[PDB]
Amino acid sequence: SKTLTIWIGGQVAELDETWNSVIKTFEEKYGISVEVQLFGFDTYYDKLVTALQAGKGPDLAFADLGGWVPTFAEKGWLEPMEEHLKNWEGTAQIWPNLWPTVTYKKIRYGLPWYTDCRLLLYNKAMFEKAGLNPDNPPKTWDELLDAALKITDTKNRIYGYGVSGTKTEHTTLGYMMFLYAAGGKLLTDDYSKAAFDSPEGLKALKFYTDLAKKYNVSPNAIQYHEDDYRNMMAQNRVAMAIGGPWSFPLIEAANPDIAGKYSVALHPYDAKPASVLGGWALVIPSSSPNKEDAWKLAEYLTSFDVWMKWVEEKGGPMPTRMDVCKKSKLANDVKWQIIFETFPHAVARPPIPQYPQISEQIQTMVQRVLLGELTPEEAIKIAAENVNKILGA
Numbered sequence: 001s002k003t004l005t006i007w008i009g010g011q012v013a014e015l016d017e018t019w020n021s022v023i024k025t026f027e028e029k030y031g032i033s034v035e036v037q038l039f040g041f042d043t044y045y046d047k048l049v050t051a052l053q054a055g056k057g058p059d060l061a062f063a064d065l066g067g068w069v070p071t072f073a074e075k076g077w078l079e080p081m082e083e084h085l086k087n088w089e090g091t092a093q094i095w096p097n098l099w100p101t102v103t104y105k106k107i108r109y110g111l112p113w114y115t116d117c118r119l120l121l122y123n124k125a126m127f128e129k130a131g132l133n134p135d136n137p138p139k140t141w142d143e144l145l146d147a148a149l150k151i152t153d154t155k156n157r158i159y160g161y162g163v164s165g166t167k168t169e170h171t172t173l174g175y176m177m178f179l180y181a182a183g184g185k186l187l188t189d190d191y192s193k194a195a196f197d198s199p200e201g202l203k204a205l206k207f208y209t210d211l212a213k214k215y216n217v218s219p220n221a222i223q224y225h226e227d228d229y230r231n232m233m234a235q236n237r238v239a240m241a242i243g244g245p246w247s248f249p250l251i252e253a254a255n256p257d258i259a260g261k262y263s264v265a266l267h268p269y270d271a272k273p274a275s276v277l278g279g280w281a282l283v284i285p286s287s288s289p290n291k292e293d294a295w296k297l298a299e300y301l302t303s304f305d306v307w308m309k310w311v312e313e314k315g316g317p318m319p320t321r322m323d324v325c326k327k328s329k330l331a332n333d334v335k336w337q338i339i340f341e342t343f344p345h346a347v348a349r350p351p352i353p354q355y356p357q358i359s360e361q362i363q364t365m366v367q368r369v370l371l372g373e374l375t376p377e378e379a380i381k382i383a384a385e386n387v388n389k390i391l392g393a
């Protein structure tokens, strides 16, 4: 009596014409009507939590691979998908580093649908205009700073490197990119304790925020993040940001003339190369009255034919299926060589129910420094203390 309802969230929800085509094909094939709701990234967690707490909303929902599935599963909000995955042809094709991201107490509660890792996204034409070689992007923090300073011309609203400092996950991810590039870690290996209140973590915090505050190579970091910077990049106003394969269809939609005029590279680093893992899974709420049809939709959406067509048309994000990654023409593109080589090393946000609260502490830490309310030393002390209380609660 309830129409099958899917909630699609995050940046990929902008590809609404592609989604409509995909869903219509499903309806034709299965004779099941689908109610679709699309959600922007920045408020999607709060909306999804609101619904799951109430026992209402979707039969199938997007959930971030960055800790949401363990958080929801711990509460009993999600239907287990072990039995379905055991019987599904596709299971052995999902990149294996993705299964821990949707696992709670050795049970899988989500089906990874797209994935990514984070990289330097940069604008070739802007490098060239500044007298830099586009095909030789910065490899180190020192080179990143030099290139960012050389490109920046704030008087003409031109910026070398966009720093995310909003109260959004992008800011945590930005800090993590620099933390791991400095040879630090977010939590201890057993997740019991904060690990970022270290000399490495301080160095990362100071450089990430200095790019915005001292060196002034970013638009206002308190107001803007990765997705804003990608759109500015399409206008040739921001030369470098953190991004990845989801960025590709989106930047090309914003400015079709930018095709071929942007690329990706391993993000510049200090002590160690770093990348962070991301993406979205499909989950079925335990309160759904339509659980079997919801699985049928998940199965269809994560099928070979659907993902082959998606990649053919849109060129991103990265399929969670190995066979599509390997059999599609993605590998012909140099952008994708870099992605496939980096992905297996990408570090994961901790797959624990505490993660969203922890991310909130990292966001606040960065913001308070950017706002001049706290020194990096003061901010990182407080954040780590709060994370340890969260983990001990």
Ligand SMILES: OC[C@]1(O)OC[C@@H](O)[C@H](O)[C@@H]1O
Pocket (backbone or CB within 6 Å): 010, 011, 064, 065, 066, 116, 169, 246, 277, 278, 279, 280, 317
């Ligand atoms: O694909 C980009 C993305 O949606 O950005 C936000 C992250 O939290 C997600 O995991 C994903 O990487």
